[PDB]
Each structure stands twice: as C-alpha cells, then as structure tokens.
Nucleic acid binder design. Structure first.
Ligand SMILES: [Mg+2]
Ligand SMILES: [Mg+2]
Ligand SMILES: [Mg+2]
Ligand SMILES: [Mg+2]
Ligand SMILES: [Mg+2]
Ligand SMILES: [Mg+2]
Ligand SMILES: [Mg+2]
Ligand SMILES: [Mg+2]
Ligand SMILES: [Mg+2]
Ligand SMILES: [Mg+2]
Ligand SMILES: [Mg+2]
Ligand SMILES: [Mg+2]
Ligand SMILES: [Mg+2]
Ligand SMILES: [Mg+2]
Ligand SMILES: [Mg+2]
Ligand SMILES: [Mg+2]
Ligand SMILES: [Mg+2]
Ligand SMILES: [Mg+2]
Ligand SMILES: [Mg+2]
Ligand SMILES: [Mg+2]
Ligand SMILES: [Mg+2]
Ligand SMILES: [Mg+2]
Ligand SMILES: [Mg+2]
Ligand SMILES: [Mg+2]
Ligand SMILES: [Mg+2]
Lengths: 172, 257, 146
RNA sequence: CCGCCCGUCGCUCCUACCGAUUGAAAGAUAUGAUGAAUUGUUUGGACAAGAAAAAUUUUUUCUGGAAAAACCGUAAAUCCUAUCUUUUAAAGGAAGGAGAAGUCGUAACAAGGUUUCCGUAGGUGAACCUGCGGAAGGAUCAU
RNA sequence: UUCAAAGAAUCAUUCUUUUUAAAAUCCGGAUUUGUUACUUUGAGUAAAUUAGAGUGUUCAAAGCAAACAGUUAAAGCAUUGUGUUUGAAUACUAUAGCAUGGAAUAACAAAAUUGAACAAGCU
RNA sequence: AACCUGGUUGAUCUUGCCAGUAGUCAUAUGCUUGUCUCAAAGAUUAAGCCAUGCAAGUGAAAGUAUAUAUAUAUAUAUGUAGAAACUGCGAACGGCUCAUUAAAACAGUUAUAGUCUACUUGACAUUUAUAAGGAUAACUACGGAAAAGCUGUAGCUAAUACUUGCAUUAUCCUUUUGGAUAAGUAUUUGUUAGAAGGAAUUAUAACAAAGAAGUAACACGUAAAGUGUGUAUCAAUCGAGUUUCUGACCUAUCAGCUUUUGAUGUUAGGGUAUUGGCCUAACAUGGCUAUGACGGGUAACGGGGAAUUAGAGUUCGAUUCCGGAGAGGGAGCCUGAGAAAUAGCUACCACAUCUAAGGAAGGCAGCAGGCGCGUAAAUUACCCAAUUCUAAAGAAGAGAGGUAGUGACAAGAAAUA
C-alpha cells in the first residue's frame, strides 16, 4: 500500500507481479481530535511502538521568543493548510494552528519579571499581548500527534502570526 | 514466509574457505558476530580444514564442548563462530597459540605464536563515535567497542589492543610511510609501506602501497590494515612476509626444491 | 511575494529569535550561489537552502523544460556501444530534477545534478550548478555527448 | 516445330480467403451494480475485578471486556454490459495448388504467322482484342 | 592551432636522456596549464562452469588432493618430546559506474556593429 | 581442421535455393547392449488433479515436576532420572516449481546524510527486600459430540509465563578528608551551541517541556572469583526495504499515449521503520513519444551460464549458485525481529474428502506414490554416518541432505583374444 499499482510516468500500466509485502504497510489514518486523552499503541516494524493519539487536549506548547514550554489544554482548532474539513472536524495535525488556554505563559511571565535562562530584552509583540489579554492564543502544532501521541506545539510569532491572522480574515 | 537465510551452499561459500564441491552440499554459515562473513572464517573450518584436528563437524563440536578453545582469550562453544582477520586463538590443551593472518593468496593460515606476543592483538578502528558525557568510543574491525580511546586515534588507524584486559597499549597512525597489510582484493596478503593516498572527494580513497620488491600496487583504503611503522611490523607475519611474487617467480621457486 | 501557499513557508533550520537566514555548502566543490545566501525564497528541497543532502551520483545534463514549479527536465544524451556492429548509437534518458529558484534556467542550459533522496514520484536529483549555454533548434534535439 | 506450351470450361483431391448467421466459444482487461471476509475508529456492555449500603441480598460510581452493530479503508466473488484477443461453425461465393493422355481454341517462344512488352481504359467463352502514351528486353546501333 | 632538434647504447633500424616558447607557484634555481569520447593502468567484484598452474583418480572423465622418509629409526627441531614439506595459483567477472598515465585521432567549449590584460587614479 | 559435395543443361558458366555433412549438459523414439567409473531424469502437455504414508521440531550442569521412579548419607537430608504440560526458541530457513512478469524483475554500479534489523559479538544504565501479587496448564472428579489436532464445568499448583516493586555520579570552597547545587535511555517538541564527514538540522553540549521501556523478586555450580537466562541504549553482524546509473527478445498491419479514477509537479498534511502521489486536501498543467512512447506477442522468470563458432557471431539458459515470484484462484489478516506465511488463520470462487446429514477438515509447484495429460521422465526403498540447519545446541530431530534401487539422458575407461 506504500507500493507500485500506479502508472509508470510514461503513463503505462505496471502489470503487477507481487502481492503486498507487509513492509509496504499503509495502516489507516488516526484522525486525532480534541477531548479527554485517549491513545492506542500500534506495533510498527521491529516492535517499534508508536502512539496513535486519537483524542487530545493537554499538549506541550512552547514560546519560542523566550525558548520555554508549558502544558495547556487546547481549546479549539482554527486553520489547516491541508484542508478546511479537518478544522471543521477539530482534528489535530502537524501544522494545525490552534488556540491554547494561554494563562500559563502569562503566569510564568509574572513570576519571572513584571506583568504581561533570562535573555529578556525582546519583551513581547503587540498582537501577542492583545491575544494574551483575552486569555487564549494561537499556536502551531509541531508533533505529528497521530505518530508521536502528543499535541506538542509552539506559539505563533510576529510575521507568521500576522500571516495566519490574514488567512483567517472574517471579511465575508 | 521470507526473512533471513540460515543456510549457506557449499559452492556459494567464499573461496578462501577452500571447501569442496563434493564432500558436502552445504557450508557452515558463520554466526553473526564480530566479523563480516565474506572476510571471516568460522571456527569449524579452522578446526577441521586448516589445523585438521577434527575430521568432522561432530568432532569440532565435541572439542568446543570442552571449554578449551579461546578466541581473543574468552571461550567459545559456537562451532560456526567467526574468527576473522587478526584474532588470536588459544587452544588450551596443546598450549598452542595461533593468530589468524592472511597468506599471500587469499587464504587464512593460522600462524603459530609465542605466549608473550599472544597477549595483544592489532585492531583497526573504523568509526569513532561520541557518546553520552562527551566520551569517544572507537569501533574496531573486531566489531568491538573501545571506550575512552586516546584522542589522537583517527578513523583508519590500527590500535594495539590487550586481551587479558580490554584497554589499549599503543596506536599507529595511518601515515604516508606506515607498514601496512591488506585484506581484500587481489593484493590481499600483500604487505607494504604506502607511497601515496588519493583522498577522492565523494568516492573511495584509493591508496598505493610499495612492497619490499618495490612493486607498487593500489588498493581501496577501506581494506587496508595498518601493521607497523616503516621499520618493524608490530606482529609476526607469516613465512612469506606478504611478498606476493609474480606467477613465473613462484613457479621458479617451486621448481627449486 | 514569498508566502504563496495556504501554509506559512518558513525555512526549517533558520533559527529566528535567538542566535548570533539558513544555507549550507553541499560539497563536492559546488559553490553556493549568491541567490541562495542572499535573496529570500523558501525551498524544502533546495540543495543549499533546504534540508536535502546531495550524495550519490552527479551527472551533467541539458535542460529540456522549465514548465514544472521549481522543477526541471534534463535529457542525458549518451552512446550505447553495440558489440555486434562495433559501433555506437545515440541514446538518451530524461532525468527530472528539482531546481530551487537560486538558478534561473531557460531551456538548453547545461546543468549538473547531484542525487539526493526521492523528492517525488520521479525526481531523485537536484541541480547544483548551471552552466549557461545557448541552443538554436529544440533542446529535445541537441546531442551533447557529455 | 509432329517442338514448346497458354487460359477458360468440365472432373477428383487438398489449402486458405469472403460469408448472412446481433454465428459460437473460451480468456483478458475497463466501467457499474451488489458485496463475503476484515485492519482501523465509533457505538455497545453477555460478564470479571473493584468502590456504596443492609445481614448472603439491594441501589449507584470506576476499571478491563466478548457477541452484536455503524462509518470510512483494503476488497474477494457473482451478475450485467463494452471492448479486445483467440480458436471455431456455415448455405453459398470466389481463389489457389495437385492430379488425371478430358473439352475449346493457339495467346507466348521464329517477323510465332497482328513484333513483344509496359501503364491505363473499354471490350470479350477462353486464352486474349482494341484505344492512348510509353519501352526495346526489336526484327533497325547505319543515309 | 608546438612543428621539430641534439646526445648515448644495439644490429639502415630499436630503447633511453636532454631542450625549444608563455603564464601561475616555490627559495638565479625548481615545480602546474581546457571538458568529454578514445586509450592505458588500476581499484572493486561469489563460486560452480570457462581458460589455466600443480597433482600418475591404475589411465581418462574426474577430484582438490597430495608428496616425502621407515619391518617401524634415523635425520631434522624442541626444552625424554615432536613427523616434515606443502597445494587448493592465475586469468576471465560487461557495452555502464569508480579512480588513473595520455602527446595522436575525434567532438565540444572558449573566441569582434566589438573582447580582456595589465599600470595609475577614485570610490 | 578458417573445408564443402549432388541437384536447373544436349553441354557450359553463374545466380540461387533444395539436398546432403558434422555437433548439441537436446528431447523423443527404433533396433542392439558382456565389464567398470560417473550420473540427468513429470521442465516442455495440465502452475491439471490427488488415495496412503512421511517432510519441524526441541530438555546430557543450568525456567517450571508431591504424574512418577529411584541411589546414597543420618523419618528427614541431599541427590539422580522424569512421561505430561506451561514457558522459551524454531517453524520466515530449507525444499519445490517457473504461472505471472519486457525498464518490471535481474546483472553490474551507487545510495540509505531516508530506514528497520531476533539470534551472535563488544561496549554498558536513568525520575515486606532473609524477597512481594494473583491465576493458569498438565492433573483429579463430573461431562458432551457420529466425527475433527473438538472442548464444557468444578477444584487445584508452579514458572525466567503474567504483574508489581526496594546509594552514586558531574559541577564550586578547604587540607586524600567535611559542606553547596543538580541528576529520565530511547523517543518527541521548542530554544540554542557545534570529533568527524565531500556535504549536517550529524555525534555531542546546554536550556524549557513531555516521555516509553528498562537498570536481575531468575537458574546452575562452576574458574584459578565463573556461567546460563534476561535486559535500556550504542556500535558491529546475519540481513531486509527502498534507491542511482547503465544494460533485454519479437511487432509500426500497435502513433500517439498519460490526466474525473494521481498522470507530471508545488505546498501542507496523513501514513510508513524511513524516503516518496504512497494516500488526503489545496494549487498548477504538466509528463512520455519516431533515440519507437502506448499497446500487442513471447511456446519469457532474470542473471551466473549452455551449445556451436577460426574470428566475428547465432541459438539456448524450466533445470547444481545468486536474485525474483508462487503454493488451486484472487483478497484479507494474526503471531512474530522477520510472513501479507499457506504442511498459520478468515472469506469468497473453483475442485474436492468424511458424516449417524446435525456438522467437520482439506490444498504434493516438499519426498516418494497414483490418475490424467501426453512424443516425453525412476522406489509408496535404507539412514541421519557425511554435509548442514534448528533446539532447552555432542547425545534430539531433519524425504534439508546423504546411500542404494530403476536408468543405453549424457560423460569417461574398456573385453569379445
Ligand atoms: Mg510467499
Ligand atoms: Mg508483318
Ligand atoms: Mg501464337
Ligand atoms: Mg504475335
Ligand atoms: Mg467490338
Ligand atoms: Mg474489340
Ligand atoms: Mg540442410
Ligand atoms: Mg568386475
Ligand atoms: Mg508439470
Ligand atoms: Mg525437476
Ligand atoms: Mg544443556
Ligand atoms: Mg516433554
Ligand atoms: Mg526459500
Ligand atoms: Mg517475563
Ligand atoms: Mg488530490
Ligand atoms: Mg512464462
Ligand atoms: Mg535459469
Ligand atoms: Mg513453461
Ligand atoms: Mg496443483
Ligand atoms: Mg497466502
Ligand atoms: Mg503440502
Ligand atoms: Mg486455499
Ligand atoms: Mg511428488
Ligand atoms: Mg526418457
Ligand atoms: Mg549430523
């Protein structure tokens, strides 16, 4: 299923002469969603287990500027450069932009210096700040939850963030 | 079903085993181990076809059962254990010590050797890994990992390695004039000095090796085993001393006897 | 316009926030062009800018097409000896290569391509160095022994 | 030269062709329909181990979990077409080859008794004849 | 499009040494200079078969063995004990790929409604 | 041994075929055959069908024995065997055939900086304990079914089955001693820092987060304190998957193909052990082709090779080795390091066996053997002795393999004076 059964670039039918060799395995997609955590183990090749997350929430999210990370419930999926169907179904994949319950980062900031190891000097964006004010912040996912079994991700920043906002843009 | 192959057919056996076409259908199939089957040799062959201590596989097995044959000083009861290029065999009852070497043909001889020199073995490093705690480990052609190797050891050079204890004695860099043995194509037994190394960019680094008849021959760097500094070898070489004669010369030599 | 896709075209291996844009050397004496080091453009499968290491064969060709996006075709023209007639005969083979927009390549231009991993159904190569060259018929028809 | 021989027309044998017959047959793909089994997920919840109360029984919560079901996804198989390939029948038709001292002529070989032959068109029992333009492989290397 | 020239050996010929321009490199001396085809050396390849070396399988087809000394020891070599010499070569493994010496023969690239080389000056 | 003779004619010289002529690890068949050596042999037709038997098991210190037997030493102590079964490992090798398959496979040549890898080897570890928890087999008793390698119930009991779960090292001060700070292997994410390799987003180091699995609740009694079994990561190895380049027969009375059905590419993903239209979505309109694409044919598995050649070549290559594929036909899974396995399973189709008619099992292209087909091909033999494999690894198994039997396939030597 990872295999041939496909035209030959010249557009000639490869007359098949070989079954399907198990090492051409194409086991089917875990459309991993939001919800309470729930993950199965699929047994890949040499007992190499991999963790089909099927529901998720509490991924590890990073804040790249400051280069730190925190575990947060993720409250909604809002964009998917693959397809809008996935976002409709609220399915987490390796480049989904999603919304983090983003109090943790704020709390961390407060603990460290001010209110909304240390190479601080950068001191936050405007857009990001605004986002924080509502509690909830946009962030890519970066793990492939379907393989790794974790919704690990990172906060979307400056230029990329702007681009994603534009993409989202509402309007009509 | 289809997985790995357990058997070896006696014609498909690598020539320098020197098996028969008759005298069997199969060959021994070296166990996985510290050597590459095409450049190893199982213990069975050693016991039966080289030393001729055994007539049969059965006899070899029996011998092994008495825990009396050591290869690199720790015992082996696996009949088809691969012995390979440099390894000292200590048959305990005779108090014989062999070291495997190459002939001037491709063939393994067991060399015969002293107690004193037996205690070490040469080992060429292949890879030099960094591992946890920034500690470097060399990996020898003996499929053996030497940890905490002396920093000046580089990827191709040989290492005089003790057997009683896992630690190393000394190392011999892969220099422009370093006494070398070969271990692959055509010039296999050959022993030379090295003239020159090519150091090709994407490819195999070919090297040229002047003999003691001053006959230059080239070889891949892959399959060259450093054995000395220009003066003296750090091991006892066989009687021929790696001097692959011409065919005519060889014939003449044969005649004069 | 750099960001043309539905996704943000980033450049993996960049490192934006901390540290003292990303390109690499690719080796075998193929000089990374100015357009890779300068000149923003994101390419996952650029030899220099992206994450594909060229390794294996290097073979010169001559471009037939630019029609695909960031992807080129190169016919290798060569001579298959036939022992019966102790003569040769022109033969050929169209290698598809990935380009990367550091190289502006019109047709008939000589290129050299390194191997690299399977980038798509057929493109296993990418162009490392583009000699200029000029052509008058169709590149299709130019034999250049090489 | 009482030589050679040409074609129709009969007669016998064999070969392949055309052939109505939606001819037939098997196989191959391609479409579509239904669709066994089943990976995965979802629903399930026979029960087997806990937690709650009464003196072994009652009600409620947490675990693992069989059957059964639903949805994608692999997808056998069967049926229906379509197309193609392959053998294969057929009244009749029309060739060919073989044979037999058969019928009718005399076409060709000699200036073969209209030189021959070409291409083309029409003709005619049959060889063939005729027209037009070619050729000499002419019966003229020549005024 | 660098043709040639001169010296020594051998039985008119063969094999060898030396220099005749220009540019870069090295402490007046000394040493790098288009691409590919082609060719030469290699490298790297399973053996069996094939060619082929050795070996009286009684011959031979074979095989990959064997030979040697002795009514039972000498001789060797080992510090009473231990047989000894060995052999199972080599070449073939494309037409492609790898490195490689190359002077010929081929291509191609370089090259004027203008092309690049230096010395000075300015940025 | 670089070879030619007869045939057109009344004769001649050519062209030209026919005929002879030799060989074939090339089949058949006819007649004939006293030795010996060697030895192909149901490929060609039907990858047609199969009665019976056999072809993968495994225990010699070393998981589990109140089935049980037994010998010592003083009713206990050790022991020594041990049917059975659980566990473990193997059964993915081997063997067979050649139907498929014509840039596919295969050969050489790369590549894996794109991966997986049991056994074997070597390195070698991290966030009640004088010893933990049940619950299961064989077994006992009660059963059922015509039958099946069918299993029901109740009661036990082990395990190396299954499940828990107990200091020291590196960074800073003092004179080897006494304090301070840390302390997760893969794996994953984000942030950086960077002894090789031609080239690194490599090794590695740090920071912020998660995080499997593990580090002996095991068994012998060994060696000159050892071993077996198990175990995280790394490397080696036995490999495997993909992959680069180049290389194939006949056909143009196959010339345009491929693209809604992924054709060509880009992006993002999903999936994979990893790369990849491998799959999904979105977007391009590509890609191949007279140097033969795409079809068709092959009485095609590929190659190493075989025959025959002076030299070229031509034909063959089912068939000793390597590779591919397949186990009646497709398809689908489980186990496992490795299978899309077929003497594993599920299903359908096509064959087909037993049945008390309810059901049940079955797959010789393993070895023999039989029918069929055919021009066309051997014994239902003996053995593990050799060669090897597997195992709890001398000690057991092996139709793998070998030895004979049949054998005018071939090949060699050689009577009949
Ligand atoms: Mg199979
Ligand atoms: Mg007249
Ligand atoms: Mg007439
Ligand atoms: Mg006339
Ligand atoms: Mg008229
Ligand atoms: Mg008329
Ligand atoms: Mg003839
Ligand atoms: Mg006799
Ligand atoms: Mg058959
Ligand atoms: Mg057979
Ligand atoms: Mg044992
Ligand atoms: Mg038992
Ligand atoms: Mg097999
Ligand atoms: Mg366990
Ligand atoms: Mg699509
Ligand atoms: Mg076939
Ligand atoms: Mg074959
Ligand atoms: Mg056949
Ligand atoms: Mg069958
Ligand atoms: Mg199957
Ligand atoms: Mg069977
Ligand atoms: Mg079946
Ligand atoms: Mg049979
Ligand atoms: Mg026969
Ligand atoms: Mg045996």
């Amino acid at each position: 299923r990872d295999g041939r059964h496909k035209l030959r670039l010249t557009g000639g039918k490869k007359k098949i002469h070989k079954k399907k060799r198990k090492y051409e395995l194409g086991r089917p997609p875990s459309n991993t969603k939001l919800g309470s955590r729930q993950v199965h183990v699929v047994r890949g090749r040499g007992r190499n287990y991999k963790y089909r997350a099927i529901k998720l929430d509490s991924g590890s999210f990073s804040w790249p500027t400051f280069g730190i990370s925190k575990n947060t419930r993720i409250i909604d999926v809002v964009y998917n450069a693959s397809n809008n169907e996935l976002v409709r179904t609220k399915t987490l994949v390796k480049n989904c932009i999603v919304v983090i319950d983003s109090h943790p980062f704020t709390t961390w900031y407060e603990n460290t210096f001010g209110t909304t190891k240390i190479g601080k000097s950068k001191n936050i964006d405007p857009l990001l700040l605004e986002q924080f004010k509502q509690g909830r912040v946009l962030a890519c996912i970066s793990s492939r939850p379907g393989q790794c079994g974790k919704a690990d991700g990172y906060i979307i920043e400056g230029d990329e963030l702007l681009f994603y906002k534009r993409k989202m843009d509402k309007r009509n | 079903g289809k997985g790995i192959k357990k058997h070896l057919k006696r014609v498909n056996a690598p020539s320098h085993w020197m098996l028969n076409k008759m005298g069997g259908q199969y060959a021994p199939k070296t166990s996985s181990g510290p050597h590459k089957l095409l450049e190893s040799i199982p213990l069975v062959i050693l016991l039966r076809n080289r030393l001729k201590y055994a007539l049969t596989f059965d006899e070899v097995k029996m011998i092994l059962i008495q825990k009396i044959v050591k290869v690199d000083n720790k015992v082996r009861t696996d009949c088809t254990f691969p012995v390979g290029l440099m390894d000292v065999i200590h048959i305990t009852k005779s108090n014989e010590y062999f070291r495997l070497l190459y002939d001037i043909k491709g063939r393994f001889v067991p060399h015969r050797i002293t107690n004193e020199e037996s205690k070490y073995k040469l080992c060429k490093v292949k890879k030099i890994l960094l591992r946890k705690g920034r500690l470097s480990i060399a990996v020898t052609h003996d499929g053996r990992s030497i940890p905490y190797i002396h920093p000046d050891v580089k990827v191709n050079d040989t290492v005089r390695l003790d057997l009683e204890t896992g630690k190393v004695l000394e190392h011999l860099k892969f220099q422009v004039g370093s006494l070398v043995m070969v271990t692959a194509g055509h010039s296999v037994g050959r022993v030379g000095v090295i003239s020159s190394i090519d150091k090709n960019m994407g490819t195999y680094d070919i090297i040229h090796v002047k003999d003691s008849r001053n006959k230059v021959f080239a070889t891949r760097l892959s399959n060259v085993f450093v054995i000395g500094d220009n003066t003296k070898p750090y091991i006892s070489l066989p009687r021929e001393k790696g001097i692959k004669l011409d065919i005519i010369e060889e014939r003449r030599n044969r005649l004069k006897a | 316009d750099v960001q043309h896709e539905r996704a943000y075209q980033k450049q993996e291996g960049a490192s934006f926030f901390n540290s003292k844009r990303y390109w690499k050397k690719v080796g075998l004496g193929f000089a990374t062009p100015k357009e890779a080091k300068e000149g923003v453009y994101v390419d996952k499968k650029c030899p220099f800018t992206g994450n594909v290491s060229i390794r294996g064969r290097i073979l010169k060709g001559m471009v037939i097409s630019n029609k695909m996006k960031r992807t080129i075709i190169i016919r290798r023209n060569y001579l298959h000896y036939v022992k019966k007639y102790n003569r040769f005969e022109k033969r050929h083979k169209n290698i598809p290569c990935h380009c990367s927009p550091c190289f502006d390549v019109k047709e008939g231009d000589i290129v050299t391509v390194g191997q690299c991993r399977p980038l798509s159904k057929t493109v296993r190569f990418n162009v490392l160095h583009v000699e200029k060259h000029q052509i008058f018929g169709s590149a299709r028809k130019q034999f250049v022994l090489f």
